Design goal:
part of a larger assembly, 11 chains, A little secondary structure (about 10), B mainly alpha (about 55), C mainly alpha (about 50), D mainly alpha (about 140), E mainly alpha (about 110), F mainly alpha (about 80), G alpha+beta (about 170), H mainly alpha (about 110), I mainly alpha (about 170), J alpha+beta (about 100), F: about 80 residues, mainly alpha, 4 helices, about 0% strand, H: about 110 residues, 3 helices, elongated, Mediator of RNA polymerase II transcription subunit 14 (chain D), Mediator of RNA polymerase II transcription subunit 8 (chain B), Mediator of RNA polymerase II transcription subunit 17 (chain C)
């Protein structure tokens, strides 16, 4: 869950 | 006035502040409408960037 | 002045986030800021001087 | 070991020119402000506006009372030599663009009554200006109105 | 030697394509020096095809041009800037690829 | 009426020749553009051999494969290693 | 080694292979400013087996305190005098595979107040130089209506009523 | 197309893996596994059947690109000539309209 | 020890500003070995390296990609069936290990072969690309030609109506 | 790695089938004995260049299919190889935007 | 076949549509309207007056 977000979290 | 008051408060038989250590429990990229209200608009949705930054 | 206000506000935000246990902590790890020098005296002197 | 694609035109774009036409431009639009046009451009745009104003005037029924008009390379300069002076202009396409009053100088300037002054408060001049401008913005018969 | 110069310059230009490194340099104050803008102006030799032939990561070149506008370096000191630029970059990349693929597949499946 | 029709025709001509000038601009870029095809193939293979030109098949929001040289590749990268 | 609070250490390979079991290993990668060879986890690795040995040999034992599965993994440094006796030394928190040291509630506030007031003081000095007060004049800071306007306003309202605004 | 072919080959190979895994780990599972594997195999076959036999790609590729360069040059010349004609016509009509407007305003 | 994220070149840079005069020139096109990132990435190389370097080749030089890819697809299904056969008879037979290695080899041969008939996807598509651009230029020229005729006809009709009304 | 839940297994079938997918199948193309450059040594033959540009060449310029519909490289072919409602979908080979 | 001969092949820039802005969760945006007839008035807006 919540991996570091390069593109924003969907 | 504000600076003198702050220094005075920090040095009047108050707990030792170097003792305590601030640790974050949970980070969720979820939208939060309560932290946005509580911090008066700045720092919404406690993400990953915000803990190294603050 | 804007920048000073922003730093003040950030500190206040962190303090308000410690005000509660919401996504935060306050465990007091029994430590001791040990300064191995006479930093205090010198610091005070120079500061007062300038 | 799954190999991707031949890349199609990405390789060609870098070799032929350099201005990356991929990703988002919002970078430049939000971070870099646009550079202003030079005087050469100014004169050409004002000449195009002169042609557009000529067309709008020959289409519009200019009042026969006076209608002293000079293109002034950017402004029709509608001027009565009597007590009024206005500068109407258009903003774009001839079918439906509104007008822009811009200037509302009052010509009634007596040296026997008003010495070292105008004849009416500037604030009232700007009020009449905005009123007549909103009235012409209706694309009814602005020249006459 | 000139070989080490070429290699270090290639590595630096390929590294400039990273918004994190750009924000690093902007915060550390390297952009404010009038020496770095001249170094950037000299670095424009990569636009030639003979030099662009050795560029593995091509996303840098366009970015380099922005660095010459003199308003890109005054900003970008913020971390939100790097956030937004990397967001748009990765979004363009992944969405272009996977959206072309998914659009083709979905249209082929729906038309049948 | 004649004047109005003439103005409309003028606008049409303008747009048409503006598009023609855009095509001429493309042709001027294209003239300098002609180059070896093999070279284009090699450059496409170079930029496309890694995850740079095309997003990977399975690339979700969370990948070490970045559009830039990461940070471990930078740590062994000539740049700062030789500056040190 | 200048200021442990102002250092951050990371490594990409260990980043995807990170799990509640491996957090101590990531802190242990060595060449990490926060952790030290003196810690006994290191001695345990040099020897063999990691079990209740931290309660047997009591000393410097870095132990995970709180854990969120994806990123958040907090580590605490303890100094044990004996079994069932724990003394907390410090806390190092790992966010997104980036290790920081938990700031003291008070060192952070001291630095924070210092920066804000230093900014206020620079602004004040600049404003004082901007000022050019004199015995004559209020304070040079270097560094109407002709009243015939009521009739003009009446005429304005009259032309408003006569020529109505048309949006 | 080619990425789809690679993904289909990988899914075919995985088919083997998931089937065997399930086995080691009832009848409907084996039925659906066999049906899915056969379907993806037939899909890989019909996708390969859509490949191209090599042709010119050089000999014809080089000849075609040279002809295309020549024709691009001649088409650029023709289109710029057409734009020249259109620009002359627009200049003429603009001069006419300007003269008409001036004559109307001079009245 | 503890190296930071990499710094900007400091060795050069000071020379490039200079006094705005006598600057260092662009470094020459080192047509040999370089060190971008960590890989050497030396110049003068092909696009699809032959499978002969690093692995066995089970396919002859005729290489009719379409026919060999179809054979390799068959070999892979038949080899899977044989791997199931090793499971019937002896799971611990060496043949399982040989079967697994060869199955990978057959799949790798398919992967090499898919790369092998891929070339139309670039240069032949480039050929269609240029033809499409030429066709678009011709279409725009035709639209201008038609637009010009329509404008000339409009001018002629309007002019007749002026003197016809006269 | 245990998996094998009816739900977990059912997800596998849908995902695998989606990526992969009366004959309506492409016309069989046989041996190609004369290749344009090495096989027939007819390099730069003008008829071949004319044929590729406008004529229908079964494998150089397109895929014939059955039912007679002709699909060029840029176009996407929808075909139904299995005797089922689900139809295989060959996306465009060139995909030039 | 072997020994491919590269010829002078000219290719036109593939600028048929540009993605001015890219939003999150997909949703492509084609802001560029590719116009000039109105761009003249758009630039006339930039022109000064004062």
């Amino acid at each position: 869950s919540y991996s570091p977000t390069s593109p924003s979290y969907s | 006035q504000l600076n003198t008051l702050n220094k005075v408060l920090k040095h009047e038989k108050t707990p030792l502040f170097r003792n305590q250590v601030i640790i974050p429990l949970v980070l969720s990229p979820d939208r939060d409408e309560d932290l946005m209200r509580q911090t008066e608009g700045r720092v919404p949705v406690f993400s990953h960037e915000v803990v190294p930054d603050h | 002045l804007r920048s000073a206000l922003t730093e003040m506000c950030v500190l206040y935000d962190v303090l308000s986030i410690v005000r509660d246990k919401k996504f935060m902590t306050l465990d007091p790890v029994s430590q001791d800021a040990l300064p191995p020098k006479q930093n205090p005296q010198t610091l005070q002197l120079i500061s007062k001087k300038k | 070991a799954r190999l991707p694609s031949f890349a199609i035109p990405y390789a060609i774009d870098v070799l032929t020119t350099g201005s990356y036409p991929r990703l988002p431009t919002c970078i430049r639009d939000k971070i870099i402000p646009p550079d202003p046009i030079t005087k050469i451009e100014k004169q050409a745009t004002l000449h195009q506006l002169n042609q557009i104003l000529r067309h709008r005037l020959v289409t519009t029924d200019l009042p026969p009372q006076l209608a002293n008009l000079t293109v002034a390379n950017g402004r029709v300069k509608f001027r009565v030599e009597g007590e009024f002076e206005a500068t109407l202009t258009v903003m774009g396409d001839d079918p439906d663009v509104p007008w822009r009053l811009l200037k509302l100088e009052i010509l009634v300037e007596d040296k026997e009554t008003g010495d070292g002054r105008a004849l009416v408060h500037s604030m009232q001049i700007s009020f009449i200006h905005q009123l007549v401008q909103s009235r012409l913005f209706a694309d009814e018969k602005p020249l006459q109105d | 030697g000139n070989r080490l110069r070429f290699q270090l310059e290639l590595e630096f230009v390929q590294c400039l394509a990273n918004p994190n490194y750009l924000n690093f340099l902007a915060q550390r104050g390297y952009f404010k020096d009038k020496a770095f803008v001249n170094y950037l102006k000299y670095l424009l030799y990569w636009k030639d095809p003979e030099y662009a032939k050795y560029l593995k990561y091509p996303q840098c070149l366009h970015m380099l041009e922005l660095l010459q506008y003199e308003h890109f370096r005054k900003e970008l000191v913020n971390a939100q800037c790097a956030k937004f630029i990397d967001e748009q970059q990765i979004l363009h990349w992944q969405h272009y690829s996977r959206k072309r693929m998914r659009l083709q597949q979905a249209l082929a499946e729906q038309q049948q | 009426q004649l004047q109005k029709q003439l103005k409309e025709a003028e606008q049409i001509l303008a747009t048409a020749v503006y598009q023609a000038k855009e095509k001429l601009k493309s042709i001027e870029k294209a003239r300098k553009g002609a180059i070896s095809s093999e070279e284009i193939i090699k450059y496409a293979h170079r930029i496309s051999a890694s995850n740079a030109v095309c997003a990977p098949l399975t690339w979700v929001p969370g990948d070490p494969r970045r559009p830039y040289p990461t940070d471990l590749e930078m740590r062994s990268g000539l740049l700062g290693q030789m500056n040190n | 080694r200048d200021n442990l609070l102002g250092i951050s250490w990371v490594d990409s390979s260990w980043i995807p292979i990170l799990n509640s079991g491996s957090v101590l290993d990531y802190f242990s990668e060595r060449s990490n400013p926060f952790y030290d060879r003196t810690c006994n986890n290191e001695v345990v690795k040099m020897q063999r087996l990691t079990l209740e040995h931290l309660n047997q040999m009591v000393g410097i034992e870095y132990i995970l305190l709180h854990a969120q599965e994806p990123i958040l993994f907090i580590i605490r440094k303890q100094q044990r005098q004996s079994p069932a006796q724990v003394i907390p030394l410090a806390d190092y928190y790992i966010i997104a595979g980036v290790i920081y040291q938990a700031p003291d509630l008070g060192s952070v506030i001291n630095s924070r107040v210092l920066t804000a007031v230093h900014g206020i003081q620079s602004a004040f000095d600049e404003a004082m130089s901007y000022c050019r007060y004199h015995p004559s004049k209020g304070y040079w800071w270097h560094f109407s209506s002709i009243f015939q306007r009521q009739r003009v306003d009446a005429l304005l309202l009259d032309l408003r009523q006569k020529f109505p605004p048309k949006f | 197309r080619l990425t789809q072919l690679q993904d289909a080959v990988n899914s075919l190979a995985d088919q083997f893996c998931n089937a065997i895994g399930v086995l080691q780990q009832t009848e409907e599972y084996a039925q659906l596994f066999a049906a899915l594997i056969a379907r993806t195999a037939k899909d890989i076959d019909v996708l390969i059947d859509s490949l191209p036999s090599e042709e010119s790609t050089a000999a014809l590729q080089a000849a075609s690109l040279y002809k295309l360069e020549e024709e691009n040059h001649e088409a650029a010349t023709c289109l710029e000539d057409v734009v020249y004609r259109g620009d002359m016509l627009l200049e003429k009509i603009q001069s006419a309209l300007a003269d008409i407007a001036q004559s109307q305003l001079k009245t | 020890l503890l190296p930071p994220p990499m710094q900007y070149i400091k060795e050069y840079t000071d020379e490039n500003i200079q006094e705005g005069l006598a600057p260092k020139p662009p470094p020459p096109i080192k047509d040999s070995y370089m060190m971008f990132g960590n890989q050497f990435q030396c110049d003068d190389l092909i696009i699809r390296p032959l499978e002969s370097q690093g692995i066995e080749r089970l396919h002859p030089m005729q290489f009719d990609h379409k026919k060999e890819l179809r054979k390799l697809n068959m070999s892979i299904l038949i080899n899977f069936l044989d791997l199931l056969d090793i499971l019937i008879r002896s799971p611990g037979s060496i043949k399982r290990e040989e079967k697994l290695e060869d199955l990978k080899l057959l799949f790798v041969h398919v992967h090499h072969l898919i790369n092998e008939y891929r070339p139309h996807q670039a240069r032949e598509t480039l050929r269609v690309m240029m033809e499409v651009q030429k066709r678009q230029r011709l279409e725009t020229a035709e639209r201008f030609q038609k637009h010009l005729e329509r404008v000339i006809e409009m001018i002629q009709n309007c002019l007749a109506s002026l003197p016809d009304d006269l | 790695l245990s998996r094998n839940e009816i739900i977990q297994s059912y997800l596998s079938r849908q995902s695998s089938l989606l990526s992969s997918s009366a004959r309506q199948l492409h016309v069989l193309v046989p041996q190609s004995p004369p290749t344009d450059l090495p096989g027939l040594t007819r390099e730069v033959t003008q008829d071949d260049l004319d044929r590729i540009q406008a004529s229908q060449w079964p494998g150089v310029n397109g895929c014939q299919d059955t039912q007679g519909n002709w699909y060029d490289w840029t176009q996407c072919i929808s075909l139904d190889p299995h005797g089922d409602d689900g139809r295989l979908n060959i996306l465009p080979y060139v995909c030039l935007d | 076949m072997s020994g491919v001969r590269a010829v002078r092949i000219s290719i036109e820039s593939a600028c048929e549509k540009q993605v001015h802005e890219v939003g999150l969760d997909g949703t492509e945006t084609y802001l560029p309207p590719l116009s000039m007839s109105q761009n003249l008035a758009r630039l006339a807006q930039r022109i000064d007056f004062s």
